[PDB]
Design a protein around this nucleic acid. Structure first.
Ligand SMILES: [K+]
Ligand SMILES: [K+]
Ligand SMILES: [K+]
Ligand SMILES: [K+]
Ligand SMILES: [K+]
Ligand SMILES: [K+]
Ligand SMILES: [K+]
Ligand SMILES: [K+]
Ligand SMILES: [K+]
Ligand SMILES: [K+]
Ligand SMILES: [K+]
Ligand SMILES: [Mg+2]
Ligand SMILES: [Mg+2]
Ligand SMILES: [Mg+2]
Ligand SMILES: [Mg+2]
Ligand SMILES: [Mg+2]
Ligand SMILES: [Mg+2]
Ligand SMILES: [Mg+2]
Ligand SMILES: [Mg+2]
Ligand SMILES: [Mg+2]
Ligand SMILES: [Mg+2]
Ligand SMILES: [Mg+2]
Ligand SMILES: [Mg+2]
Ligand SMILES: [Mg+2]
Ligand SMILES: [Mg+2]
Ligand SMILES: [Mg+2]
Ligand SMILES: [Mg+2]
Ligand SMILES: [Mg+2]
Ligand SMILES: [Mg+2]
Ligand SMILES: [Mg+2]
Ligand SMILES: [Mg+2]
Ligand SMILES: [Mg+2]
Ligand code: NA
Ligand code: NA
Ligand code: NA
Ligand code: NA
Ligand code: NA
Ligand code: NA
Ligand code: NA
Ligand code: NA
Ligand code: NA
Lengths: 66, 105, 137, 33, 104, 244
RNA sequence: CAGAGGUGAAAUUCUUAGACCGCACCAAGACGAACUACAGCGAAGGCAUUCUUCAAGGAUACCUUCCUCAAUCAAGAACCAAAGUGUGGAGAUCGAAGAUGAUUAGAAACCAUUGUAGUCCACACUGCAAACGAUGACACCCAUGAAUUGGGGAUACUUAGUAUCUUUACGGGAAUAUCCUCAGCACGCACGCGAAAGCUUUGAGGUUACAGUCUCAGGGGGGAGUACGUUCGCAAGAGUGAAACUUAAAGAAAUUGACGGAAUGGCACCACAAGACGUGGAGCGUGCGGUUUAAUUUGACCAACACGG
RNA sequence: GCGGGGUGGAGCAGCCUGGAGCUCGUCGGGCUCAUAACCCGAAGAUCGUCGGUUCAAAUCCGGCCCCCGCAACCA
RNA sequence: GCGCGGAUAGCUCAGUCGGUAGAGCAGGGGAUUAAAUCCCCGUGUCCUUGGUUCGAUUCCGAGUCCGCGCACCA
RNA sequence: CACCAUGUUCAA
């Protein structure tokens, strides 16, 4: 229902008003899984830092770089 | 001063005479039904308090008022009585708030 | 649902997916290697109730997932890719849903055979829509 | 803005307005002739 | 008013030729001369880095040995369409004269 | 968009049993001529013979497109950029016996061969083979700078471009006219005719590359069943009609 | 098999009588992508697929011929983009007029879907372009570096090299390298010139130290390229072309500011974002305006209105 | 002679008894440096007039006063 | 008179056929930064009856109204 | 790439 992702690095505040942050996350899955060690770029609402965890609940979309 | 253009004294006078009442009520309100809560105990209501109110896991003057359709002032009075006879036990207490619960076995 | 050729389990049965991605809609169209017989065609407008979201990448991904589900029932487990833009006298730039449709096919589980861009190119064209001053927006 | 101050309407449209004025003046002389 | 460019904005000297046939702009279709238009030849990847990795992972033919195909377009822009799209910007008067003969 | 159709039928109302489409389809094999080692490339569907609509009448004439690297299953990357088309001539059970239709370089490869400061020279050659096939050849060539060259362009003189065209036309007509269709296709897919052109036309003009970018068959002889059987050799068996 | 199209978003519009999409074809009419360039040809207007054909044209080469035959030009003649006109075709795309849908306070405007004349061809008119290099033609002199297109030549000093690749037939070949040369389109430029911007063997240079030749035009801004007459045109128009009257400036190029629904980099909760607590609704205190009054003293209208303590 | 219409300041529905609606206009407050546009609210009707019917009349039945049509032919 | 269709929220409609009343617009609220777009409530005795399939918007017989195309001896 | 019109006369 939801997959936990660990924020690898923050790519910068996105858009006007700077309320959205572009981050790079690593999917936290068991070894040998199809999602293991795979990485996506995501948009995050709220204060986020490196080594922060998010429940993505959808890992197919990738945010447009900005 | 922002003196309005082409504004008359008759235009002024007609403006204040029509400015009484009318525009108001900027909130919806959504009125509620009255609460008919008894201020004194009846025979059948007092019987429920002595029997049904115990063996309730959580007992509170506002809860008992919601069950027996009585005021909280006398709902709290009956609960203080049930504690005097050790039928219910008091778990949390202050000046403004009391919490009771049923006794074990 | 079976409906496949007489091949062993795990054999690659190839189709061709024609991904026509414009700026108003996206098409995911699966045919054979001759293009004559079509297995499934799902467009991005078949997934969204709004009209401004038919070209969206999400609608193309949703359409590409319905294509894989029907292609599994037809016995097709591999695909050759022919992407195209509007072409002709109009824009050669591919639409927003081109990459989303192709990636969703691979992610949903599909062997991507060959990728070719087949947008119509004129060696000499007719007059394009608009005046000699173009679209004055 | 590629040109300098016209001190009037667009010269192309003034020329067209003069153009139509000459047409109606030569039609009024034709009917009297 | 004053002559902004000795080029006059086009690659047409005074005694080179008379007329150069116009092209339709890539964006809006405005008819602009072929030597005046702002021409860019672009080579674009069909998928971005992440999308290419996913598709090449599922591809028997595509990988490190065989690269994915690219898009080759010669884009010619109207001057208004090139400035708005920011493929070309206004420059200081001194910097206006510098030209690039190869893609950088 | 969803739920936006105002006039579904132009007549009104809704008229089916939810019949499955693939229940009526039959699977076939497309067989390439014998000069390609992957004979049974591609698979296709078709309706069953229902009433007077025989499935073999609609299957004939279909053109199947395949990559040359997949058909020849070997050799380098120079043929991964070529695609070959085959026209179905006969239906032998579940097999679709085909004949060469056209060959073409992929759009990515052709677009990547263009450089600015050279000259692009195009030649179209029409020839008829020994068995009566007429083809258009569409050769393309590009000039190159020499290693010594310091000049800013390598444009060609128009008399050397016209000489290159007439030599290419002579060699192609001289070779492809004497051979049959099967030998002509072998000469084209194996690059033997291409290398003869670059070897003989580079003395005319330094060429970066000379390649045949599209061959098409424009005229065909009347159908000959024995000639089709000769071109296919040993037709591999089709297991599509077999029980499962 | 259920939408497609179109847009900022939509709608006009097409669609289970099967649209859109897919494959190979057929028809017709335009056009000749990438290559395509501060490149070539042409008197200008203009001119990009191939092959075959006609008459031409410039440059180059020459110890060929001739012997002033030349330069520029009122009058006159030929050509001249697009649109437009006439008669026959053609009619795919696009599209003045028109229609419909949007937007809007309005919006038969920009945007969308269409669509007539046109757009294309033959013959004949027209002769109005930012027809521009806003720069007349011919001739001389004129500093520098890197290039480019075509043709050739070579491999106050008595003479100053050099290679590379392909090579069984438009082939004693083609392209390169180095040096020179004539002709052409130009770039970054020493004098000099210019109000400046800028021009500079490609002059806008060699001009108060004013003179090589010829020709066209201008004389403050408007009225006005209008009126009248006249010539030419099927028409549309084209050529020629005033006056009365009106006006103190109109223009040119640069400078500094200011402004921009132009671009770039930063900053501020008298900005926003994430929020908090309110004000705007009630009663009342107070200030301000109005009304009233003998007077209701008066200033102030983001940076006036519990402010003038 | 025949047929139709008078409804908030303008134009027009309802005229199918029990009721007045739409757009604009007016007024009050917002936005604005300010006006317009735009946003949030409000007020304003003898349904021409005089009678009759009906429990009840814009609304039904008659008179009147205006407004607009169509007819006014053969001599 | 005869064969067909439609009678279902405030408006426009699809019904599942013979065990279970829903979509768009309108109205109210929330996400929204101007519409627009999304989320939730909206709210109909299924034309009038009888035969009631276990139960009838559904199946059927009769009537009313409206659109079709056809018949006309007091 | 929704919509964004205007500012009485002289003189600081
Ligand atoms: K247009
Ligand atoms: K300049
Ligand atoms: K020239
Ligand atoms: K011109
Ligand atoms: K069809
Ligand atoms: K059109
Ligand atoms: K004239
Ligand atoms: K200036
Ligand atoms: K302040
Ligand atoms: K006061
Ligand atoms: K005004
Ligand atoms: Mg613009
Ligand atoms: Mg606008
Ligand atoms: Mg300007
Ligand atoms: Mg300027
Ligand atoms: Mg001027
Ligand atoms: Mg050259
Ligand atoms: Mg659509
Ligand atoms: Mg070409
Ligand atoms: Mg003359
Ligand atoms: Mg014309
Ligand atoms: Mg004509
Ligand atoms: Mg139009
Ligand atoms: Mg002129
Ligand atoms: Mg001039
Ligand atoms: Mg002099
Ligand atoms: Mg004068
Ligand atoms: Mg503020
Ligand atoms: Mg208050
Ligand atoms: Mg108040
Ligand atoms: Mg301040
Ligand atoms: Mg104060
Ligand atoms: Na330019
Ligand atoms: Na407006
Ligand atoms: Na010019
Ligand atoms: Na030349
Ligand atoms: Na005249
Ligand atoms: Na200035
Ligand atoms: Na806030
Ligand atoms: Na408040
Ligand atoms: Na004065």
């Amino acid at each position: 229902q939801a997959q936990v992702g660990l924020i690898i690095k923050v790519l910068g505040r996105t858009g006007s008003r700077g309320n959205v942050t572009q981050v790079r996350v690593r999917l936290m899955a068991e070894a040998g899984s199809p999602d293991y060690n795979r990485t996506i770029v995501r948009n995050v609402k709220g204060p986020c830092k490196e080594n922060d965890m998010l429940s993505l609940m959808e890992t197919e979309r990738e945010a447009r770089r900005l | 001063p922002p003196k309005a253009g082409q504004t008359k004294k008759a235009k002024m006078e007609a403006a204040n005479k029509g400015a009484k009442k009318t525009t108001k009520k900027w909130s919806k309100g959504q009125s509620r039904e009255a609460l008919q809560n008894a201020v004194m105990f009846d025979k059948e209501t007092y019987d429920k308090l002595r029997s049904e109110v115990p063996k309730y896991k959580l007992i509170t003057p506002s809860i008992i008022s919601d069950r027996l359709k009585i005021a909280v002032s006398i709902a709290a009075a009956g609960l203080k009585q049930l504690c005097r006879e050790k039928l219910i036990r008091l778990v949390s207490c202050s000046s403004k708030t009391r919490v009771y619960t049923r006794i074990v076995q | 649902k079976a409906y496949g050729p007489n091949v062993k389990k795990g054999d690659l049965v190839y189709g061709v997916v024609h991904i026509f991605a414009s700026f108003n809609d996206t098409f995911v169209h699966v045919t054979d290697m001759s293009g004559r017989e079509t297995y499934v065609k799902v467009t991005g407008g078949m997934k969204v109730k709004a009209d401004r979201d038919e070209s969206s990448p999400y609608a193309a991904m949703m359409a590409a997932q319905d294509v894989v589900a029907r292609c599994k029932e037809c016995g097709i487990n591999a695909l050759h890719v022919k992407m195209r833009a509007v072409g002709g006298v109009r824009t050669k730039s591919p639409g927003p849903g081109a990459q989303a449709a192709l990636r969703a096919l691979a992610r949903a589980g599909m062997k991507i055979g060959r990728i070719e861009d087949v947008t119509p190119i004129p060696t000499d064209s007719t007059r394009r829509k608009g005046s000699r001053r173009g679209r004055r927006l | 803005g590629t040109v300098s101050r016209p001190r009037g309407m667009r010269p192309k449209w003034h020329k067209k307005r003069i153009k139509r004025l000459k047409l109606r003046r030569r039609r009024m002389r034709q009917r009297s002739k | 008013m004053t002559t902004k460019r000795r080029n006059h904005g086009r690659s047409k000297p005074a005694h080179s030729r008379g007329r150069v046939k116009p092209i339709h702009c890539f964006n809006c279709g405005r008819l602009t001369p072929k030597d005046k238009a702002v021409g860019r030849f672009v080579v674009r990847r069909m998928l971005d880095a992440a999308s290419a990795r996913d598709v090449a992972e599922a591809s028997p033919v595509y990988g490190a040995n065989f690269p994915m195909p690219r898009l080759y377009m010669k884009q010619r822009f109207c001057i208004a369409c090139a400035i708005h799209s920011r493929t070309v910007r206004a420059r200081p008067v001194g910097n206006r004269k510098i030209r690039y003969t190869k893609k950088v | 968009a969803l739920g936006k159709n105002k006039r579904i039928s132009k007549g009104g109302k809704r008229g089916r049993g939810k019949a499955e489409t693939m229940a009526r389809k039959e699977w076939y094999d497309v067989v390439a001529p014998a000069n390609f080692e992957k004979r049974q490339f591609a698979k296709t569907i078709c309706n069953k013979t229902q009433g007077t609509r025989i499935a073999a009448d609609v299957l004939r004439g279909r053109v199947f497109e395949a990559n040359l690297a997949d058909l020849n299953q070997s050799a380098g990357e120079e043929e991964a950029y070529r695609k070959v088309r085959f026209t179905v001539q006969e239906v032998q059970g579940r097999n679709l016996l085909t004949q060469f239709h056209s060959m073409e370089v992929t759009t990515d490869k052709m677009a990547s061969l263009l450089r600015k400061w050279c000259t692009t020279m195009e030649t179209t050659v029409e020839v008829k083979t020994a068995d009566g096939y007429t083809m258009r050849l569409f050769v393309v060539a590009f000039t190159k700078p020499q290693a010594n060259q310091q000049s800013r362009n390598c444009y060609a003189k128009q008399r050397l471009v016209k000489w290159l065209r007439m030599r290419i036309t002579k060699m192609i007509k001289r070779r492809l006219s004497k051979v049959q269709i099967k030998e002509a296709v072998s000469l084209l897919t194996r690059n033997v005719l291409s290398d003869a052109l670059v070897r003989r036309c580079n003395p005319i003009l330094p060429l970066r590359e000379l390649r045949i970018r599209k061959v098409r068959v424009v005229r065909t002889p009347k159908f000959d069943a024995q000639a089709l059987l000769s071109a296919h050799g040993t037709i591999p068996a089709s297991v599509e009609a077999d029980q499962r």
